[PDB]
Amino acid sequence: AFCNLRRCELSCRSLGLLGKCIGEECKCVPY
């Protein structure tokens, strides 16, 4: 599915990660 990525990606990008959608919720990893 898609994710509520407006929660994660604008907080994960500062470490040089991306916000990745894990079916229906976000985790973060580079890159």
Enumerate the H helices of the chain as residue ranges: 9-12
CA 6 to chain centre: 8
Does residue 31 have a cis peptide bond before it, meaning omega lies within 30 degrees of 0?
A: yes
Query: What are φ and ψ of residue 24, in 5° steps?
Result: -140, 10
For residue 30, give the nearest of 15, 2, 21 by alpha carbon. 15
Q: What CA–CA distance (Å, rounded) separates 16 from 2?
A: 22
Token pair, residue 1, equals 């599915």
Name residue 26's beta-bridge partners. Answer: 21
Q: Is residue 26 within 8 Å of 19, Cβ to Cβ?
A: yes
Method: NMR
Handedness of CA 29, 6, 4, 8 (dihedral sign): positive
Residue type for 17, please? L
